[PDB]
Amino acid sequence: MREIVHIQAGQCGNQIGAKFWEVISDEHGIDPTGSYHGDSDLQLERINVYYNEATGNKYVPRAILVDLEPGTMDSVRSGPFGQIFRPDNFVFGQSGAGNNWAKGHYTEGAELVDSVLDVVRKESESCDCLQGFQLTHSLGGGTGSGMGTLLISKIREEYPDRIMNTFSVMPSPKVSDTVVEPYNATLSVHQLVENTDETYCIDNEALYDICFRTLKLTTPTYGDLNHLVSATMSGVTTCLRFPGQLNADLRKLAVNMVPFPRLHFFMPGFAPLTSRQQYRALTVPELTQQMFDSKNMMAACDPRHGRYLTVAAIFRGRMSMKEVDEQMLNVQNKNSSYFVEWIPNNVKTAVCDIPPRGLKMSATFIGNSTAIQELFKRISEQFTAMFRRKAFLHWYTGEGMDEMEFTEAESNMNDLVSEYQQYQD
Amino acid sequence: MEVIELNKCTSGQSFEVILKPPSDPSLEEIQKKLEAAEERRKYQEAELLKHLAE
Amino acid sequence: MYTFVVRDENSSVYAEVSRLLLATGQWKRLRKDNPRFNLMLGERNRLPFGRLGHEPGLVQLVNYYRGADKLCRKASLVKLIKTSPELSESCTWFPESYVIYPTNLTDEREVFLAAYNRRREGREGNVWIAKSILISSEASELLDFIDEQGQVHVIQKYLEKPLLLEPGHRKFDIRSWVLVDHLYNIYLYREGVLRTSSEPYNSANFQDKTCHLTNHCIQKEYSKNYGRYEEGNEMFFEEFNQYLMDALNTTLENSILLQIKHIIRSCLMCIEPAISTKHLHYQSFQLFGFDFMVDEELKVWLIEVNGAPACAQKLYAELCQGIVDVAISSVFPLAPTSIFIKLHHHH
Amino acid sequence: MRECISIHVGQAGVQIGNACWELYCLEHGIQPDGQMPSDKTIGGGDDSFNTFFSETGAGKHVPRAVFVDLEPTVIDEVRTGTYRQLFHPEQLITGKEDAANNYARGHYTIGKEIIDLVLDRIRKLADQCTGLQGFLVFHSFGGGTGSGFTSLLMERLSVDYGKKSKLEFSIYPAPQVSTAVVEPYNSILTTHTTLEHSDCAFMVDNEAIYDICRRNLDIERPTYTNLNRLISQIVSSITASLRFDGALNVDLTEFQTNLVPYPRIHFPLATYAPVISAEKAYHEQLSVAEITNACFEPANQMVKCDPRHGKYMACCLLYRGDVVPKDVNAAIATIKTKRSIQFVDWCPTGFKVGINYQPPTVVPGGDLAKVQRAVCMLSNTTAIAEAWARLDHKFDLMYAKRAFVHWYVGEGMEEGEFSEAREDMAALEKDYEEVGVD
Numbered sequence A: 001m002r003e004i005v006h007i008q009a010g011q012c013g014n015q016i017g018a019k020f021w022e023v024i025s026d027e028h029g030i031d032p033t034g035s036y037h038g039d040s041d042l043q044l045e046r047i048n049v050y051y052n053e054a055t056g057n058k059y060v061p062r063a064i065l066v067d068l069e070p071g072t073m074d075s076v077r078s079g080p081f082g083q084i085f086r087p088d089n090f091v092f093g094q095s096g097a098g099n100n101w102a103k104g105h106y107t108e109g110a111e112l113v114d115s116v117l118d119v120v121r122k123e124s125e126s127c128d129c130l131q132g133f134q135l136t137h138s139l140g141g142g143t144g145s146g147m148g149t150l151l152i153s154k155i156r157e158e159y160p161d162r163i164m165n166t167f168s169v170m171p172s173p174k175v176s177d178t179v180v181e182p183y184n185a186t187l188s189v190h191q192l193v194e195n196t197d198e199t200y201c202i203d204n205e206a207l208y209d210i211c212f213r214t215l216k217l218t219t220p221t222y223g224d225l226n227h228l229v230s231a232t233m234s235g236v237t238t239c240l241r242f243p244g245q246l247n248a249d250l251r252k253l254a255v256n257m258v259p260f261p262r263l264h265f266f267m268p269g270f271a272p273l274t275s276r277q278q279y280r281a282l283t284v285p286e287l288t289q290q291m292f293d294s295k296n297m298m299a300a301c302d303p304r305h306g307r308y309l310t311v312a313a314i315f316r317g318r319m320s321m322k323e324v325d326e327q328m329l330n331v332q333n334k335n336s337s338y339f340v341e342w343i344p345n346n347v348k349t350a351v352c353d354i355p356p357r358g359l360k361m362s363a364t365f366i367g368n369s370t371a372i373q374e375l376f377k378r379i380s381e382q383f384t385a386m387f388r389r390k391a392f393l394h395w396y397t398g399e400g401m402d403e404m405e406f407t408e409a410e411s412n413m414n415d416l417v418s419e420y421q422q423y424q425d
Numbered sequence B: 001m002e003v004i005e006l007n008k009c010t011s012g013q014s015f016e017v018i019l020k021p022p023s024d025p026s027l028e029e030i031q032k033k034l035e036a037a038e039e040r041r042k043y044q045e046a047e048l049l050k051h052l053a054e
Numbered sequence C: 001m002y003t004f005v006v007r008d009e010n011s012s013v014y015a016e017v018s019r020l021l022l023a024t025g026q027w028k029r030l031r032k033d034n035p036r037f038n039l040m041l042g043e044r045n046r047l048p049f050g051r052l053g054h055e056p057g058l059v060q061l062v063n064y065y066r067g068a069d070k071l072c073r074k075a076s077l078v079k080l081i082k083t084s085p086e087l088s089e090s091c092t093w094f095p096e097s098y099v100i101y102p103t104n105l106t107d108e109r110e111v112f113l114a115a116y117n118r119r120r121e122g123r124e125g126n127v128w129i130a131k132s133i134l135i136s137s138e139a140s141e142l143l144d145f146i147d148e149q150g151q152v153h154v155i156q157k158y159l160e161k162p163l164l165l166e167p168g169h170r171k172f173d174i175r176s177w178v179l180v181d182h183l184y185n186i187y188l189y190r191e192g193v194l195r196t197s198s199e200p201y202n203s204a205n206f207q208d209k210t211c212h213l214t215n216h217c218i219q220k221e222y223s224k225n226y227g228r229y230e231e232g233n234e235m236f237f238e239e240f241n242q243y244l245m246d247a248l249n250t251t252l253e254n255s256i257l258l259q260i261k262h263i264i265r266s267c268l269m270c271i272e273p274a275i276s277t278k279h280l281h282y283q284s285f286q287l288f289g290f291d292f293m294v295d296e297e298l299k300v301w302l303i304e305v306n307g308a309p310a311c312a313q314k315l316y317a318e319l320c321q322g323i324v325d326v327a328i329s330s331v332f333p334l335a336p337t338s339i340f341i342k343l344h345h346h347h
Numbered sequence D: 001m002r003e004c005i006s007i008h009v010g011q012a013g014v015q016i017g018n019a020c021w022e023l024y025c026l027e028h029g030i031q032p033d034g035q036m037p038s039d040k041t042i043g044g045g046d047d048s049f050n051t052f053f054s055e056t057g058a059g060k061h062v063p064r065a066v067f068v069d070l071e072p073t074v075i076d077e078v079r080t081g082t083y084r085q086l087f088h089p090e091q092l093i094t095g096k097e098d099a100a101n102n103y104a105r106g107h108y109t110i111g112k113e114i115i116d117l118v119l120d121r122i123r124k125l126a127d128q129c130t131g132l133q134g135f136l137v138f139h140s141f142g143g144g145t146g147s148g149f150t151s152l153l154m155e156r157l158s159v160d161y162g163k164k165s166k167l168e169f170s171i172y173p174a175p176q177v178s179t180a181v182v183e184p185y186n187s188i189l190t191t192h193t194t195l196e197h198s199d200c201a202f203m204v205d206n207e208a209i210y211d212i213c214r215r216n217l218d219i220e221r222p223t224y225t226n227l228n229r230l231i232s233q234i235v236s237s238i239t240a241s242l243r244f245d246g247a248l249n250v251d252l253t254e255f256q257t258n259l260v261p262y263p264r265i266h267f268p269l270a271t272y273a274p275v276i277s278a279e280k281a282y283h284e285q286l287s288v289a290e291i292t293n294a295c296f297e298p299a300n301q302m303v304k305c306d307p308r309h310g311k312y313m314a315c316c317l318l319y320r321g322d323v324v325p326k327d328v329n330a331a332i333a334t335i336k337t338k339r340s341i342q343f344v345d346w347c348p349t350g351f352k353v354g355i356n357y358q359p360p361t362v363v364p365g366g367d368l369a370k371v372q373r374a375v376c377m378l379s380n381t382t383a384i385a386e387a388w389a390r391l392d393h394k395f396d397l398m399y400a401k402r403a404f405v406h407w408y409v410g411e412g413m414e415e416g417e418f419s420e421a422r423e424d425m426a427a428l429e430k431d432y433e434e435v436g437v438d
């Protein structure tokens, strides 16, 4: 009984979180009302990892929904699986964060964080043995970014020895709501460097390019982007939600994926990504070559520009496990110049028999690559372009922040980039 | 090629064949190790909380 | 795509083989410390055979036989021949040799003096050579020369009746390149080389070692007739076979090559059970340089076996390409009239 | 009769231990419910099998075993498995969260809080023994529990049972069947602190078992079940002398006397044959010579290495099935003349031979075919140092960059323990080189 507590904060965080519970609820056979209707015991084997069991054989997600304005969480409650969430687990304010990291982190967010921690404390107290936490959020806004990292900081203070993982959407000018996103993202990245064990970096630009160029979506929406994130979140958590020789909890995963405490930012990937030639059976070679292709990755970083510290692939569906080793052992021994030679056997593979909905088989990629430095480089450049003129800072100084805290956040992320650069050589 | 020490019982037998002749930490000390590591974990946690209180 | 690593930058041979592998467009060279390789062109000394054959999914092949040093070591070869029943102590093609340890350090000092005194008393030619070089007909000088050193030496009978080429009245030796693949097939390169002495052989003066030592480095450094009779004191089989027909009315095959092929098989079959990589988690092949002497009776003697040999400049292309065909491509195929002679044998 | 207590630590130890006790029951005629019809002494007796099984007044034959794991999922299989009735709950110990493949976490953080409980439970089994010989400790090298808690347990056992022998069955890490990357660290950390507390350790390389299951049993992708069924056959061959009437390796002390002249060099190489696929139409039964010759082929060793280039310090031949000494000696002579068997000059060039007439038992519905005779050769070779050289090299690659070290320091371990443990392994490699090479 290794329970995980899920938190989703802000607009992006709650919309991606909603789709996540919609996707895995389907895989575990949980209907919108929380009743199980599956046909395999594998669905229930690890059900308690993400779900609580209430009276009447009801399964209720162990999820905490947080926001500083009500709108997004009213949509969730009216959404497909809205009624599946615990009523007490909606924690929201009315003021909003105005895409302002200082409001989420220092003013508005501080007013609401204690009541969120009251809910977290309640879910944890009813856990046989808490694995850790996972947070979904964006870094470009105010609530997910500013209040998200405040929640993490206070969760770590109360649960210092528990694992803290996040799915963090990184802002991109091509899919942007406001010009202050580089400010909000740079401020959050430092919080994540210090207080998370594993951060899945989801880049909105990569999600967009995949929708437009690969999926052939002329006009991608936030919904389309969140379809990719749901599938990815379902893949990276397969090993936690189903049985298999892999086993592994959050800590054992972190121990083998993170060689250095600050370099814990991961590039996730998924295959297939088929446009609508969608019924074609995908062979194992195609799954592997696509999974390792840059176009299939969601950090918007070319791995051929850096070196893999550690790689983890998860294959789902009924396929040849001998042929999985042959193709995986082929991609390594055919591109070994992008794997560091001082971590032996740093490419690991796992198989799960249950495929995602509507797919004969799939592959999820989890790479800890030093190429991720390109993502932080982009953010730093956009930050500096504005900060050198102190442009748009009044929104933040008006919330009590000093310019010194921005200078520090800048020096911290440039440090982070430099730390990736030395391990890339 | 000699066979020495041939022993036989109802469930088997054994023998030897020679082809050629030839030519702690106390309980206390372990407690200190464990408690010392425990103290170092406490010190590192105190530095974390001190960081978070700042 | 096949991957290989190069761990001996000083090998003139495998520098070419590596040059060819890349020329095929189907082989990729990795860093010398990358463990995910198919082929290792390993270092001469202290090659870590224990780390081979443990990479999942990779069939790994190395260009050295772990344990072949017993054949390519001066002292080792002597002990192997004497103590191996397949070769026995009466081995008729290996000069009488004795392993002698310097006195400042089993040992065969008394055994040698026993055979030496026998020769001195029987008026027989009693000249020996010490190496690990000094040539003398007195046992006192040979032993005192080894004690002044600090490593193990070997004293063997000096062929006082070598076959001398005419004109010139000069000594020589024969280099044969032998390739042993992973299946332990013994391939003899059809092209050999004679490293001839450019000075007239003189039996009444072993002090000047320029006419007794046919080494390519001693002739090109201490000989005053280097390159007179053949370019670089190197005669190839075609010319040598022609000389044997004109002067001796015989052939290189009949008079010498049969004995060479016999000696190569005998040495390599003897140690096959000790070095074969048949049922091993990794595979081995290796190129050998056999050095032979020929006396005036057209009898062939074995001088030594080199485990890391070089090649004659004129034969690098042919032999190196041949190594890729039978040794490397046979285990890693790509997307004639063989240059070798297969020496069949029972495994 | 002197008792042997088995201890199973971590996932590998527990699952290996489960497979072994299933085999022991089939070998001794013990039903899943603990009953043993052939045992005519109800709730008592000092027979050979009593070294591994106690007896209740009701006639149940209870293993002298303790299962320890910091997580309950693996040991829960024992509680609900076929042989759930054999064990009582006191013998099965489970925590709530494991060591996360972190030696420091299993040895220090969690180990400190559970060591006294495990000792108390082992004390309960010890108090049932009239003359305890010692302990057999099953564990993995790479697991956080199998490496970290095992070494702590071995340290304490040396304190609480000074005059008792301790043997190990250790799973050497193999990438082909492991998702961890830090196992070289755990392997070296546990060997360093365990070395002076183990009298004889049988290492089983998962790489070797994996390839035997693919090459001989035609398993395209072997699982832990296939691996453990084969491993328990070897373990049974090694412990059979303690459980059956005989005169060779009759007590744990004899394992050290016959196999370990030098204390630190206490890692014998195990070779087993034949391994025949049960799915085969029908195999030709191999002779004494053929299976004895197979013991000198690298392909059926528990650790892949080349004994032709090491030196032997000892050599036991354990035969099961239709074998008479006549054929053994005839096969030995034939192998000395054809093999490269170089003993060290300060050791006799001999072979201790043991014959048990009962042929190997195979689990119904298993992968292994029933054979009429089989052999396990225990040989102390310097060649097994290849396994330390490989492992130490992987250690050096990561430690040069301090990769993953923070996880261990984070649990209270000092960075100096790494280097201290590493220098002990360098010394161990040097010992093998002084005895083996000239």
Ligand SMILES: Nc1nc2c(ncn2[C@@H]2O[C@H](COP(=O)(O)OP(=O)(O)OP(=O)(O)O)[C@@H](O)[C@H]2O)c(=O)[nH]1
Pocket: D009, D010, D011, D012, D013, D015, D016, D069, D070, D098, D099, D100, D101, D102, D106, D140, D141, D142, D143, D144, D145, D146, D147, D171, D172, D173, D174, D177, D178, D183, D206, D224, D225, D227, D228, D231
């Ligand atoms: N042969 C064999 N090896 C196993 C088995 N189970 C795990 N292993 C190996 O053991 C190593 C992993 O350590 P585990 O024993 O699973 O971990 P642990 O001892 O329970 O310690 P934790 O880290 O706390 O889980 C890997 O190298 C696995 O290949 C098994 O049943 N049979």
Ligand SMILES: Nc1ncnc2c1ncn2[C@@H]1O[C@H](COP(=O)(O)OP(=O)(O)CP(=O)(O)O)[C@@H](O)[C@H]1O
Pocket: C095, C129, C131, C156, C157, C158, C159, C160, C171, C172, C173, C212, C213, C214, C215, C291, C293, C303, C304, C306
């Ligand atoms: N017993 C003997 N009788 C006659 N000549 C001998 C001899 N032993 C050695 N030589 C001469 O010495 C030369 C070879 O020397 P040797 O092979 O012992 O040294 P080396 O091994 O450093 C040269 P390489 O290994 O390159 O062939 C030959 O040219 C040969 O003429």
Ligand SMILES: Nc1nc2c(ncn2[C@@H]2O[C@H](COP(=O)(O)OP(=O)(O)O)[C@@H](O)[C@H]2O)c(=O)[nH]1
Pocket: A009, A010, A011, A012, A013, A015, A016, A097, A098, A099, A100, A138, A139, A140, A141, A142, A143, A144, A145, A169, A170, A171, A172, A175, A176, A177, A181, A204, A207, A222, A223, A225, A226, A229
């Ligand atoms: N992928 C994805 N990104 C989103 C979504 N909604 C907002 N974003 C991104 O998140 C950032 C804005 O943060 P937001 O979550 O709206 O602010 P918050 O509500 O204060 O936390 C911008 O970079 C948006 O592009 C969504 O549904 N999906």
Ligand SMILES: CC(=O)Nc1ccccc1O
Pocket: A097, A098, A099, A100, A180, A395
């Ligand atoms: C970034 C920011 O603060 N934006 C904003 C703009 C107008 C009113 C309130 C606001 O918060």
Ligand SMILES: CC(=O)Nc1ccccc1O
Pocket: A236, A237, A239, A248, A253, A256, A257, A312, A313, A314, A348, A349, A350, A366, D179
């Ligand atoms: C699923 C995940 O995140 N981790 C993982 C996957 C396959 C092998 C090893 C691993 O650690």
Ligand SMILES: [Ca+2]
Pocket: A111
């Ligand atoms: Ca207010």
Ligand SMILES: [Ca+2]
Pocket: D039, D040, D041, D042, D043, D044, D045, D055
């Ligand atoms: Ca009884």
Ligand SMILES: [Ca+2]
Pocket: B024, D158, D196, D197, D198
């Ligand atoms: Ca002891």
Ligand SMILES: [Mg+2]
Pocket: A011, A012, A141, A177
């Ligand atoms: Mg918004």
Ligand SMILES: [Mg+2]
Pocket: C304, C305, C306
């Ligand atoms: Mg030489």
Ligand SMILES: [Mg+2]
Pocket: D010, D011, D071, D098, D099, D143, D145
């Ligand atoms: Mg475990």
